[PDB]
Amino acid sequence: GHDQSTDVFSAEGRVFQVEYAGKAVDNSSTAVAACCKDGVVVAVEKVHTSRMLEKGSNNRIHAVDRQAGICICGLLPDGRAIVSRARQEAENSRDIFATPIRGSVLANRVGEFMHAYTTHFAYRPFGCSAIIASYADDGPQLFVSDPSGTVAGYYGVALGKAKTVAKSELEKLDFSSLTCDEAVGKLASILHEVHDKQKDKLYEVEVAWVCDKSDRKFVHVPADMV
């Protein structure tokens, strides 16, 4: 009975319903992201169940503002809830403060929102990690908010089922030197290596960036660079 509600600590001060939501994210399709000096690139492997989807279906990458986006990893519907909240924060920043939301701020807001659903018996934690990619006045930034609401900045990041491998491949990259052009290639390449073929037979790799070439607008990358 220690593990049925997120309002409860176990005897070791764990919150199991959060660890469990965590597992939802780890059993999900893989995402990676890299924060360069010219921008952020985020890529994610969409696993279809049907051969008959439209290309575009179940986008896991959403813009949240002109300069920021969120790639979701885990339960896509839960993520669209976060994406909606991120968008409300971004709008608020523009409407009240007349400034684009800084990325650290956006990720904090996202984290606070996710964390809130780990405190109260009536809601459950979200089953998704959000990767936030911003390029506002704070510069290129890449955060991840996990279901606990813990938020961390990264140079590069990998989530989902192939996360342990994808991290090994992301460690081979030189983040000080790497550019958004190169990264679209590398990050996509990485998701092709770590994809398991005999399990998940149907897959595209969705990529998005926000960078100096995109006029610091967060956008899917044209499907010529992939």
Partner 1 sequence: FDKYITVFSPEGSLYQVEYAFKAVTYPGLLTVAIRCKDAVLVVTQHLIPDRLMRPDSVTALYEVTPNIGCCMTGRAPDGRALVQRAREEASDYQYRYGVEIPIAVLAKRMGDKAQVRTQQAGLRPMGVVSTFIGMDQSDQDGSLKPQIYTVDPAGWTGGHIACAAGKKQVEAMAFLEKRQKSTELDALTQKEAAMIALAALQSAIGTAVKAKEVEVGRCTAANPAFQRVPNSEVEEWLTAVAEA
Partner 2 sequence: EAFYGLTTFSPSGKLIQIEYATTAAGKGTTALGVKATDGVVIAAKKKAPSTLVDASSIQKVFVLDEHVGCTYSGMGPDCRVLIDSARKNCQQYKLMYNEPIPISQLVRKISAIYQEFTQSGGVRPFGCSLLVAGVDANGYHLYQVDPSGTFWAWKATAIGTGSPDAKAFLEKRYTVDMELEDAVHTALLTLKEGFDGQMTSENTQVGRVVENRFEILSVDQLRDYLDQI
Partner 3 sequence: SHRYDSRTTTFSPEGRLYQVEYAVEAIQQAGTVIGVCTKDGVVLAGEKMVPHPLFDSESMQDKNTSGEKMYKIAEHIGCSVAGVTSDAYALLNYARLSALRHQYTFQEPMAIEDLCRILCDEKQLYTQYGGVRPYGVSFLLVGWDRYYGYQLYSTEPSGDYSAWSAYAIGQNDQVAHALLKKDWHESMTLEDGMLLALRVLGKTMDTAKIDLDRVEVAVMRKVPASNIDQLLDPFKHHPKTTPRFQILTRSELKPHAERADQAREAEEKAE
Strand partners, 218: 210
Measured from the CB atom, the residue of 4 and 49 that comes closer to partner 3 is 4
Alpha helix locations (H) across 14-75?
16-26
91 binds, among partner 1, partner 2, partner 3, none (CB under 5 to 8 A by kind): none
Contacts of 31 (CB under 8 A, 6+ apart): 42, 43, 44, 45, 60, 71, 73, 131, 157, 158, 159, 160
Q: Binding pattern to partner 3, positions 2-21, x when CB under 8 A?
A: --xx-x--------------
218-220 and 139-145 beta bridge pairing:
unpaired
Of residues 122 through 181, those in contact with partner 1 by CB under 8 A are: 122, 142-143, 148-157, 167, 170-171, 175
Measured from the CB atom, the residue of 171 and 215 that comes closer to partner 1 is 171
Residue type (1 letter), 212: D
148 binds, among partner 2, partner 1, partner 3, none (CB under 5 to 8 A by kind): partner 1
Strand order in the sheet with 61-65: 61-65, 68-74, 128-136, 139-145
Q: Using only the alpha carbons of the chain, give its radius of gyration.
A: 17
Determine contact, residues 64/86, Cβ cutoff 8 Å.
yes
| 9 part of the interface to partner 2, by CB under 8 A | no
Closest separation in Å from C-beta 75 to partner 2 = 24
Q: Binding pattern to partner 2, positions 104-133, x when CB under 8 A?
A: ----------------xxx-----------
- For binding to partner 1 (CB under 8 A), which residues are involved? 1-2, 5-15, 35, 104, 108, 111-112, 114-116, 118-122, 142-143, 148-157, 167, 170-171, 175
- For binding to partner 3 (CB under 8 A), which residues are involved? 1, 4-5, 7, 121-122
